[PDB]
Amino acid sequence: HMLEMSQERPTFYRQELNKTIWEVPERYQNLSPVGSGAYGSVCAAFDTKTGLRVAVKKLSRPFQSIIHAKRTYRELRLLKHMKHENVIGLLDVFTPARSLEEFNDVYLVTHLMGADLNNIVKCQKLTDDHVQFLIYQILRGLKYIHSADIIHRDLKPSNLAVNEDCELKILDFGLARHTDDEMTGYVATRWYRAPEIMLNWMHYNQTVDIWSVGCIMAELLTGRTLFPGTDHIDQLKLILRLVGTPGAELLKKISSESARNYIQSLTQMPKMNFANVFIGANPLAVDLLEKMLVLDSDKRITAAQALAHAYFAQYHDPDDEPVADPYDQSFESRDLLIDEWKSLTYDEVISFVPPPL
């Protein structure tokens, strides 16, 4: 058993790209801004050490406030935990800073992907086999994310990244923090959200993400957003029209008195026939869709269970659907100063050990 006693610091070079000065290790070459701001300050690059096309995100002044500092620490902790084919993970993390004292920039390095689901949908008409392989991969990655006791919270086509070979990685898990305005009106930001988080019926858990997969799957099959509500209330009515109004058993699970009061005011509707809604679709696709889009979150199919569904017969491999280690999120309930979040972040950067690729 031999041991490493110190870490080598690479040579860095400077470059002005996003109107900001990027300082990166020599290994990273041909830096080029991607996404026209949709992903933030992200550059595509070639990693000469691994031969990988990579995405490099710069977080400038990430310790400006207590919230920003904790968010910076949260994102890093999240990315360091994920080692899965269908989940975005960390290839590298670096700072040009030689001490904690001068440390005010964090760079994150992930795999470079070709497009998000939104963009591949406008370029192609997806076959049932594409939908099989894409949804299989989302669920495979979700099984892993959920086994680490992490909730995505904001699964939508725009944070599902896809390659030319139809291989998929899940982005933006565990960190989505939206304003009221961003969730207002006729907006994609809300169309995929489970009814219980959209209107805050109860304390939410991972089953929230399965609802989102159901909405995504339906849209891939039909070419149409499943619940494109013009507001929160219009969306809910769309949802209940399809899945029926709550029964007595679900009503008493709704911890919010006011939300329970509003629900009971609505004319009761039965669940529709999904075979008459999703006409011409693989009957197995429709079956799984019914097990995902259940109003009561307790009764929804889980990611692990859905993997064993007959719809994924040609892709399902129980020996190649791995779980994660537990994710220690005890820091979430911790109140700390800016300098304490910064030091914690610095610790995580310098302690990073690269994958054996």
Ligand SMILES: O=C(NC1CC1)c1ccc(Cl)c(Nc2nncc3c2cnn3-c2c(F)cccc2F)c1
């Ligand atoms: O999900 C992330 N963080 C949350 C989970 C904690 C996270 C953080 C940093 C980075 Cl660098 C990334 N990776 C990426 N971020 N945006 C777009 C990305 C991408 C990788 N590829 N692409 C990409 C592209 F460059 C062009 C077109 C389509 C694409 F999906 C993800």
